[PDB]
Each structure stands twice: as C-alpha cells, then as structure tokens.
C-alpha cells in the first residue's frame, strides 16, 4: 500500500502520497460560508465552500481558518477540509491507505487526541501517525543535526535536534508567524490609505506579502533610505485596479519577525529565540547547531531572510564560531517532503498506530510507545 503524508497546515493544506517529490494537493485551508442570499433560484450552491474552490469565490464568502495558531479551533470545518482533501483533491478513499499527519510542537494534548479520534472514527483510516512538523523539515533538508526553524503560516517553533535526538526542553514556540504578519500588513497598509477590514481581502494583502515584501539587511539604514529615496516604492495591481505603491511598508511587515515589539508581542525575534534555543542546549553540541541552523516554512521564503538571520545570529553568537544556514529553495514544502521520506521508510512500518492498537486503548494511544 501507499501512505498519505497529509499536513493540516495553517493557510495552505498539502496532501500527497509517500513517494513523491512535492505534494499533489496544495490549497489554502479555508471554509467559507456564503453571507448573501442568492436571488437566482435553482443555482444549487452549497452551504460550505472549502479549499481552493473558495479562493475563486472570495468576494461573496466569509472565509474562515479552522487552524488559528496551530490548534484546530473548529472541528466541523476541519473535517470538511480533510474530506475535501481526500475525496476531491486526491480522489482516494482512506480505507485502504495509512495517513501521516503532521502536528506542531507544544500543541494541546486534546488537539492531538481529538485529531486521532476524527481520523479513526469518521474517515476510518487503518493506521495513522502524528509526527512533529519540525523534524520532517530536518529529513528533507538532509541534516542529521541542527536547530530547525519551522516558521509556519500559523506558528513559529525553533526545535533543536542533535544526532537525531531532539531536545525537548530547548524547543521554543512563538505564536508570531505569517498569519499575524498578514494582520500587521493589514494594519500598516491602512497607514498609507488603503483599507482592508473584510477577511475576503485577507487573501489580497497576503498576496502582496508573497510578492513585494522582503527582510531587509539593516532596519534603521533602510528606514533612512525609504524615507528619503524612492527606489523601494514598488507597485501592485489589485484584482480590480487601483494599483498601490508600497514604500517603507514593504520591509516593515516581515521585520516584525525580528521585532515582535511592533505588534505588542513580548518575546524576542526569531533571530534570538534561535539563540536562546541553542544556549538552552548543552555547551558542547552548540558548534554543530550554529553551523546547521535550518530554515523551513512558508514564512521563511522572504528574499534576504537567510542573510539577515545570519547577520543577527552571528552578532549574538561567539564570533569565533562558524555560522551557516541551510535553507534550500523548497522552504515551504520541506515539512511535507521529509514526510514523504518518513512514511516511505521500511523501519517506520512498526510506528503506525493500528486500529487494533487504537480500539484497545482509546484515543490516548498517541502519547504511548507509538507516537
């Protein structure tokens, strides 16, 4: 048989078979109810638009994300996301297919257990597994060691692994991620004059975020440049017209990753929670972690975050120590691709939570010897 390496995601959902390069089904995890009435009779529109079908009908929908910050907050939506994932995007019944889910570190126990209940009871998967979203991005990156920075769309967690042993205590989890950056770019495009309050244009400004934004190498020098020069004023075409010219709001959205004091987050940036995650480890394995710092996640695909990250983490580390960042150009899907390595291993066959192993011990089987 073949195992499906699913990925719940937080703004995109990717699902493909174990044994592929890239996932066969990548779409945003949205569920839209239609707000307006519909005067045309006999149209037969559904009560719930899910997935990429709801990305083409955005101006009529109330788009909702069932995964706010890692956690699933509405399970009746997430069941529709999975049902649309298996039946429409992949067109395979999960009765004869194992399923690899990927859940972030430090989630609630009830989230992982409830996810296992929804997989075994409703979909009747024969054997599913729940794997940690930062370790798979260490499989795909081809490193046995090194702190990995999985800055997802939903949540940003800085897991260290040395010689295949993850360090549980040093794992740092930060709520600030791509969703909150998109909310901050909604906050600072109002500073220019372009209002975005409706969630349907949440997908518009995020697309701005995909194209225009970049992590600047310095901040006060680039704020000294964009306030006087006009070389950074880059325009963008909305889907109706009224092209907008973003100047200093371009490198100011992704800087909130490195200055969480912009949005009132107490913590340090992910250039220092990486350093506090390395200093939390023992003082002899740090040398491989400073060399093997991995970046993954969609939020890490800004142009120039690998140089600003290296500049700040070099400014915090001892200067006699080599700093290297392994960031292959598939940063976004690296959580999936190692999953396609994970379920394809023959030694992983013992790791599946079987249904016979499930029904004997209920939903709390996930935190036992099988993970």
């Amino acid at each position: 048989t073949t195992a499906l390496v699913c990925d719940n995601g937080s703004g995109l959902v990717k699902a493909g078979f174990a044994g592929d390069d890239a996932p066969r089904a990548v779409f945003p995890s949205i569920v839209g109810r239609p707000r307006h009435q519909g005067v045309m009779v006999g149209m037969g529109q559904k009560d719930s638009y899910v997935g990429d079908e709801a990305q083409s009908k955005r101006g009529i929908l109330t788009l909702k994300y069932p995964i706010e910050h890692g956690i699933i907050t509405n399970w009746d939506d997430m069941e529709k996301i999975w049902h649309h994932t298996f039946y429409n995007e992949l067109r395979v019944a999960p009765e004869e297919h194992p399923t690899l889910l990927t859940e972030a570190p430090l989630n609630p126990k009830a989230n992982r257990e409830k996810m296992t209940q929804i997989m075994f009871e409703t979909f009747n998967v024969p054997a599913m597994y729940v794997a940690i979203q930062a370790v798979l991005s260490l499989y795909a990156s081809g490193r046995t060691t090194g702190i990995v920075l999985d800055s997802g769309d939903g949540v940003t967690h800085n897991v260290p692994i040395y010689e295949g042993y993850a360090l549980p205590h040093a794992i740092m989890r930060l709520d600030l991620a791509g969703r909150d950056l998109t909310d901050y770019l909604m906050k600072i495009l109002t500073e220019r004059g372009y209002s975005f309050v409706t969630t349907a244009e949440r997908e518009i400004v995020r697309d701005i975020k995909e194209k225009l934004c970049y992590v600047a190498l310095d901040f006060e020098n680039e704020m000294a440049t964009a306030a006087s020069s006009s070389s950074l004023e880059k325009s963008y075409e909305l889907p109706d017209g009224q092209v907008i010219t973003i100047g200093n709001e371009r490198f100011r959205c992704p800087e909130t990753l490195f200055q969480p004091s912009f949005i009132g987050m107490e913590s340090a940036g992910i250039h220092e929670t990486t350093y506090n995650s390395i200093m939390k480890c023992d003082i002899d394995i740090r040398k491989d972690l400073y060399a093997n710092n991995v970046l993954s996640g969609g939020t890490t695909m800004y142009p120039g975050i690998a140089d600003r990250m290296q500049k700040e983490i070099t400014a915090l580390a001892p200067s006699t120590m080599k700093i290297k960042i392994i960031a292959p150009p598939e940063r976004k899907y690296s959580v999936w691709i190692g999953g396609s390595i994970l379920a394809s291993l023959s030694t992983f066959q013992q790791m599946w939570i079987s249904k016979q192993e499930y029904d004997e011990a209920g939903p709390s089987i996930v935190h036992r010897k099988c993970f």
Partner: protein, 520 residues
C-alpha cells in the same frame, strides 16, 4: 548481465510464425560503477578503439579508456578479447539490419553522449549548497553530442524544477545529489536505448504470419559467487534465486501429479525464507532502499542496521566467516549454494536512481532519436536500482508463471576449449551455481527410486526369490508383494502404490548387497 527471451511464435496447429525478443534486467550499475576486476559493456570500449576514426572525430573522444571517469573505476581491457573485433561485430550488425543508416550514427551519439556526463565537476557555491558547474567544457561537448542546449542542461542538472499543486517550484541540490543525477540519467538513457534497440531488432525479426502460442526460450546470467559479492552480484543472485523458486514449485506440482496417480511442506518453502529475507519489506533490498532516504546514513550505518534487524531474527542471515584471505566480508546469506558473503561498501552510491525530470524534458526537446526514446505516482526523486530490479523481476515472473518450463543446463569444461582435462572444482561449483544439486536433493526428500513391479521382478526377484524362478505366473503387484514380504524391510522404508513401487534414496544399493551374497 541481462536476460534474453526469444519467443518463437507459432500458428494455430503448430506452424512456425515469427519470433520476438524482450530483454530483462540490463544492469544500470554496470554502466556507471565498474569494479577493477570487471568491465563495462563493450560499446564504449569500441569507440575508444581506433578501429573507426570517424566516430572518434565525431564524438569528441580522447582515444583513452583511462581518461574517462566511467571507464577508469574498472578494468580497461583483459586478455582473449579485442576491442576492434567488438566494433567489427557492431558495424556488421549495424551496416545491414532493418533500421536505417542514421540510427547507426545515433546509437554512438548516445553512448559518447553518456561518456561526457561524469567528467563534470559540479563545484559547490561558496556559502551555499547548490552545485554550480564552472568547468563547463566537457558537458558542453556532451550538449554538442546529444543535441541538447548547452546552458539548459547545466541549469536543469543544477536546479531540478518540480510541480507542486499547480505551480512549479525549484529545489536546489548539493554536489552529491547532482552526481547521482548525472549518473542516474546516463544509466536510464542507456537501458531505455537498449530496450529500444531490442524493439528495433524485433521489427526486423517479426514477419506477418499469425503469431499464436509461443514456445519461447529464455537465457539468463548464472547465480555467481565471487570473492566480491556486491549489489551488482545481488542483482544477479536474487534474480536466479527467484528462478530457482519457480523450479521448486514446478517440480512439486509434477512429483505431486505422479504421487497422486500412483496413490502413494512444499519444497519451494526450502527456498522461500531466503526470498523472505530479500523480497519482503524489512528485508535486505528494502533496508538498502530506505537506508538512502536518511540524511546521514553511510554504509557502516547500513551494516549496523542489518545487524540490528536480522542477526538471529532470521535463520538465513548470519555473520560472515572469512577464509583464505578474502578482502572484506560484511554479511553472509546461506542461499541454496550455501554461505555467501557480501560487501556493503558502496551500495548506497550504486543503489540510487534519481531521474532528473527537467533534464528528461530537455531530452524530449532535443532533435535526435531520444525524442522518440524518452517519451498515485511513485518515486520521482527516490527510485532505486533495487526497486526496478524488483519490478522487472516480478514482471519476468508473471510472464513466466503464464508459461510451462522445460529446463536446459549448460556448463563449460574448464578454461581451455579442450579434451578430457575437466577440472572438478569448476564442475562442482557450477553444480551448485546452476541449481542442479538443489533439484538433485529436492527429489531425495520424497521417493526417487521409481521402479516398476515387473521391473522389480525381472531384476530384483533374484535378491530373495521363492523356490521357483520368475516364469510370469503371479501378477506383478502381488509378485512384488511376495518379494517385500521376505526382504526384512520395515514399512516406513517403502511406500506401496498401483502402477509402480517407490523406494527411498538408499535402497537399490541394498537390493544388491544381499544379491552379491546370492551371486557370491
């Protein structure tokens, strides 16, 4: 290295119609990885020969097997073979056959197109991982030889573009994965070219008579046991292992048919465990396949994992004894030939077949034969020589389970084409390597002594007769029951039937030790 399969197709009532060939298991690693006591396929050596200078001007070849990286890991040449004789074979077969004259240029274009792949450096970028070719002289010569573009080949090898959802994204690579790509494309295009050539010869060999119900004849390499059993040798050994597995079941159905006619565990199980060690998941081919997928798994880690999974867990798997100064032995499998060691070192490099997809697209775009040659998914980036060995061997099996075998063995006397100076180590070794001693010993577990009742009375009534000679006055079943009722032989030694009587291996010499007491 490969297997032949010549179907002489017939008509409806046994009239010779046609013939076709479909060759199996052309060895990819043989193209790329050559042992120093081994050689490549002959075509590269033919072009390296000065027999035809127009190919040497044509293919930009430096007249030297030692120079090229594919042809220097192994042996350049040995005795009793001549490279110009090899080209003398190929230009004779290439001058006249069913094809046209341009493909004679094209096959050589593809072989010399393989040759310029591996010499490329693919230097790592500074403070990066993506391997950039800066030494681009030899892959430029390749791109002139194939017909591909010069820059597009280098960008495609350096940055393979894949399809995610709807939109393409590129990945990077490191120097290692791009070396496995530039070997993997060469072994893939060589095996697909050779299978293509088998179809091109098939176009000549097929005649328009109605082809029905073939009596086809397969040839294959022998189950060979060297001092350097490697994954190449595993690709021979498990193939002939599965063929022997078909023999054991095929003997068992026939022996079952005679024993059910006469009224008197399966033998394939005797081999099955070894295939259980090799074919099944959590088996040595599977552990070798998944061992590649890890980030930092070397061959020492692979042997550590095999010892973790199978040392004592499976009865076939056992630690290798090294006798007489073998160089190194890492695990031993007692096959049907016996304890057979293996060498782990270098299996992870030769197992890989990452088919670089965008370079296959550029292979399609090039104006050559290759446009016609290279025209739930599985393993776009992780497909291995063991996996295609598994699939091709299963396809040969399901081709073979639809037929009815008639085995032929064939052995060499010794090194010299000679009169009776046969050297018994060679015949004793090819006794076990051909599986002959296995079918010798499988029939011994039943009753091989198949003697007819009147045949037991015309020859072995002399052993313990009555006071009267033979005469043919008692029915031969009772005429042998009269014999065995006075031979002082217990019931567990023989089994009585209807048409014949059978005896255990070790009784028709007991039918003469007391007969020589009668003939004393």
């Amino acid at each position: 290295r490969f297997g032949k399969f010549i179907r002489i197709h017939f008509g409806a009532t046994g009239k010779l119609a046609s013939a076709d060939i479909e060759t199996y298991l052309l060895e990819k690693s043989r193209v790329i990885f050559q042992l120093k006591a081994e050689r490549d396929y002959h075509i590269f050596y033919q072009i390296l020969s000065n027999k035809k200078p127009e190919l040497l001007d044509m293919l930009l070849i430096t007249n030297n097997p030692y120079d090229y990286a594919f042809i220097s890991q192994g042996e350049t040449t040995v005795a009793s073979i001549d490279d110009a004789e090899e080209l003398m074979a190929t230009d004779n077969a290439f001058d006249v056959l069913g094809f046209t004259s341009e493909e004679k240029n094209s096959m050589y274009k593809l072989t010399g197109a393989i040759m310029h792949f591996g010499n490329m450096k693919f230097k790592l970028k500074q403070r990066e991982e993506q391997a950039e070719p800066d030494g681009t002289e030899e892959a430029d010569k390749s791109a002139y030889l194939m017909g591909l573009n010069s820059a597009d080949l280098l960008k495609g090898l350096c940055h393979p573009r894949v399809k995610v959802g709807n939109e393409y994204v590129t990945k990077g690579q490191n120097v290692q994965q791009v070396m496995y790509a530039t070997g993997a494309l060469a072994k893939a295009v060589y095996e697909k070219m050779f299978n293509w050539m088998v179809t091109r010869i098939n176009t000549t060999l097929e005649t328009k008579q109605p082809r029905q119900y073939f009596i086809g004849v397969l040839d294959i390499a022998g189950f060979e046991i060297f001092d350097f059993n490697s994954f190449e040798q595993l690709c021979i050994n498990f193939t002939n292992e599965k063929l022997q597995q078909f023999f054991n079941h095929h003997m068992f159905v026939l022996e079952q048919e005679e024993y059910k006619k006469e009224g008197i565990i399966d033998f394939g199980m005797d081999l099955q465990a070894c295939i259980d060690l090799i074919e099944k998941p959590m088996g040595i081919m599977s552990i070798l396949e998944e061992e590649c997928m890890f980030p930092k798994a070397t061959d020492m880690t692979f042997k550590a994992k095999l010892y973790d999974n199978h040392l004592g867990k499976s009865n076939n798997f056992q630690k290798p004894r090294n006798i007489k100064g073998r160089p190194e032995a890492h695990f031993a499998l007692i096959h049907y030939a016996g304890t057979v060691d293996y060498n782990i070192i270098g299996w992870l490099q030769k197992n890989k077949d990452p088919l670089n997809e965008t370079v296959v697209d550029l292979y399609k775009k090039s104006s050559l034969k290759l446009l016609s040659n290279l025209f739930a998914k599985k393993g776009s980036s992780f497909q291995t020589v063991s996996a295609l060995h598994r699939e091709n061997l299963n396809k040969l099996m399901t081709n073979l389970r639809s037929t009815h075998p008639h085995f032929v063995r064939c052995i060499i006397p010794n090194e010299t084409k000679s009169p009776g100076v046969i050297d018994n180590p060679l015949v004793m070794h090819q006794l076990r390597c051909n599986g002959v001693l296995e079918g010798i010993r499988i029939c011994r577990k039943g009753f091989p002594n198949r003697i007819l009742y009147g045949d037991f009375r015309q020859r072995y009534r002399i052993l313990n007769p009555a006071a009267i000679p033979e005469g043919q006055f008692i029915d031969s079943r009772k005429g042998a029951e009269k014999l065995l009722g006075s031979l002082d032989i217990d019931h567990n030694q023989y089994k009585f039937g209807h048409t014949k009587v059978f005896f255990k291996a070790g009784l028709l010499g007991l039918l003469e030790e007391m007969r020589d007491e009668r003939l004393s």
